[PDB]
Amino acid sequence: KYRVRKNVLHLTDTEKRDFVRTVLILKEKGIYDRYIAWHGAAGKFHTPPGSDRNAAHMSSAFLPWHREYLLRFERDLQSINPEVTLPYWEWETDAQMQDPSQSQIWSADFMGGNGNPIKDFIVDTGPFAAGRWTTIDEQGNPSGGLKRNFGATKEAPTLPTRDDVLNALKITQYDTPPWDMTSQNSFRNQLEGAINGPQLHNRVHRWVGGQMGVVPTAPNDPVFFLHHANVDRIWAVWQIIHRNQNYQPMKNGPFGQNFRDPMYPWNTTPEDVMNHRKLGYVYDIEL
């Protein structure tokens, strides 16, 4: 319960500065790119092979995989600066703004702003602007700078709402057979946002555009973690509320999606990460 994960909006200027500084060190040290590689690597690991499901997306392990991912990332942040925890991007409240792109998350002392359409949507402002921050492609090579294009798409013009989130929280079953993009009455599939998609998680990715708009390049934007922190938070809340509903499938799902299978590229199981508090962190709204 010790590590407290705060809403981006409640961060002090000092906190915002400290977080960015720590990320920039993770980048400079070679560590940040391991996260990009791990995420892409899970996308190529299909469960079972030739299925549309993979280790991190399109099936039950979507939630615990990303939880494990953020935890490792946070420990790395911590090892540079023990005062630093992983903030979350409460995007359903940004959604309530007349213009969500005016959110303070996108300020130059934080994430920086939207892309420059004269420079093919290259991010120009903030700590991660072209020149200060280099990106990698799906092959592991430099790809020339962060891009963003907020709301550009027809299918994802807006961020998910507070009501979308509340409706997902009403769902009873964690997941359902056949444990994929077609599952119904599935919290997992709901939060992930395949149900009449893109909705919720998938929608945020789409809305941001740039590298975030394409799954294998998504972690290239540091806001990927802030976004996923919000997803992980929504999930933790679902668990608090539905205390007897456990992870599914317990067994006899595809290998890698069961409660006790390891989650490639790790040996970590969904069981290992089910109780977030046990992992050493808590979300501010729990207090």
33 is in an annotated binding site: no
Interaction mask 137-166, its own copies, x per CB under 8 A: -xxxxx------------------------
Q: Is 27 in the site for its own copies (CB under 8 A)?
A: no
Residues 6+ apart with CB under 8 A from 116: 122, 123, 124
Q: Which member of 10, 44, 170, 260 binds its own copies (CB under 8 A)?
A: 44
Using rule CB under 8 A, residue 252 touches its own copies? no
Any known ligand binding at 68? yes
Residue 113 within binding range of its own copies, rule CB under 8 A = no
**DSSP alpha helix (H) spans, the chain:** 13-28, 32-43, 62-80, 91-94, 162-170, 187-192, 201-208, 223-241, 270-273
Q: Helix, strand or coil for residue 4?
A: strand
Residue 147's beta-bridge partner residues? Answer: 122
Q: Which is nearer to its own copies, 209 or 254 (CB)?
A: 254
Minimum distance from CB of 12 to its own copies (Å)? 32
- Compute the least distance from the CB of residue 31 to its own copies, in Å: 8
Return the range that interacts with its own copies (CB under 8 A); candidates 48-56, 90-98, 170-178, 234-242: 48-56
List the one residue from 179, 264, 281, 283 that touches its own copies (CB under 8 A).
264
Q: In what helix (H) or strand (E) does residue 3 lie, and over which residues does it extend?
A: strand 3-5
Is 201 annotated to bind a ligand? Reply is yes
Q: Which of 108, 55, 8 shows the shortest CA–CA distance to 215?
A: 55
Residue 16 near residue 108, CB atoms below 8 Å = no
254 part of the interface to its own copies, by CB under 8 A: yes
Exposed / middle / buried, residue 260 (Cβ in 10 Å: 0-12, 13-18, 19+): exposed
User: Applying CB under 8 A, does 37 fall inside the site for its own copies?
Assistant: yes
Residue 43 token pair: 């996308």
How does DSSP assign 154-200, residue by residue? SS--SPPPHHHHHHHHH--BS--TT-STT-SSBHHHHHHT-TTSS-T
Which residues are near its own copies by CB under 8 A? 29-31, 33-34, 37-38, 40-41, 44-50, 54, 134, 136, 138-142, 254-256, 261-262, 264-265
Annotated binding residues for Zn(2+), as ranges? 10, 13, 39, 46, 52, 57, 66, 68, 92, 109, 120, 163, 201, 205, 228, 242, 276-277, 284
